[PDB]
Design a protein around this ligand. Structure first.
Ligand SMILES: C[C@@H](c1cccc2c(-c3ccc(CS(C)(=O)=O)c(F)c3)c(C(=O)O)[nH]c12)N1CC(CCCN)OC1=O
Ligand SMILES: [Zn+2]
Ligand SMILES: [Zn+2]
Length: 232
């Protein structure tokens, strides 16, 4: 009923949308992994009379439910999707998207890692993002590669019309107590990558983490703080 949703409102298999700004929504779903349940976020950005999707809803059935929820709540077609790194919370559901008319994109690094992991593989490669600090335009967003953080391939997304910074899994929510799933992380480079984000997007008004509640720019410093303590 208006607050940002959590698992206690999200059974696995259901998707909720949350209006972030004009023409910007997050999507929230939940999934089981290794016997625990987690929420995860993605983004939807209005692109004229179409929609750009950032990240799947963490699995095939969640992603089908996402498309249904978008049709119910927004009613514009999703034409393109970008996955911001290679893990299942970002690409699991790409096959569903591809069979629903959506053109799927990721960096070549993400595509290679997804293929090696046995995860679903976006169709199209996003060039121009291979060096930290690189940025490219993609419809109504800017894609930015900050350097290695949660993963070596993680991308962040900026919506300039609304000053919305979608950090993906390189950014944690303010309540976080540790740096999340660090299996593929670079804890030593992560603060430097976060500093790059802070320097590039100083006018961000909303910051959305890969998992958990949006807030403001403090999410970036908080992330650096929890990661430094995790490394140590
Ligand atoms: C599918 C993904 C994965 C699965 C399960 C959980 C997460 C988490 C996670 C965990 C805890 C918290 C709360 S908190 C900040 O307070 O701790 C959280 F916010 C996020 C993250 C992430 O942090 O983004 N991602 C997860 N996977 C799979 C995987 C294995 C790759 C092996 N090569 O690696 C990975 O990330
Ligand atoms: Zn991940
Ligand atoms: Zn994640």
């Amino acid at each position: 009923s208006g607050e940002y949703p959590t698992v206690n409102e999200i059974p696995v298999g259901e998707v909720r949308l949350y209006q972030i700004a004009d023409g910007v929504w997050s999507h929230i779903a939940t999934q089981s992994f290794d016997g625990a349940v987690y929420p995860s976020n993605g983004l939807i950005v209005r692109d004229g009379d179409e929609l750009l999707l950032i990240d799947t809803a963490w699995g095939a059935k969640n992603t089908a439910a996402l498309l249904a929820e978008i049709e119910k709540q927004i009613g514009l077609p999703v034409t393109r999707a970008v996955s911001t790194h290679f893990h299942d919370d970002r690409v699991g559901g790409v096959d569903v998207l591809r069979a629903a008319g959506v053109a799927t994109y990721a960096s070549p690094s993400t595509r290679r890692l997804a293929e090696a992991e046995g995860n679903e593989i976006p169709t199209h490669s996003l060039e121009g993002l291979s060096s930290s600090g690189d940025a490219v335009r993609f419809g109504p967003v800017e894609l930015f590669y900050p350097g290695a953080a949660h993963s070596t391939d993680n991308l962040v997304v900026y919506v300039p019309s609304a000053n919305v910074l979608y950090g993906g899994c390189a950014v944690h929510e303010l309540s976080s107590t540790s740096a999340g799933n660090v299996a593929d992380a670079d804890l030593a480079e992560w603060p430097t990558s976060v500093e790059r984000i802070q320097k590039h997007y100083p006018e961000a008004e909303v910051v959305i983490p890969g998992h958990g509640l949006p807030g403001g720019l403090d999410l970036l410093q908080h992330t650096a703080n929890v990661v430094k303590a995790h490394k140590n």
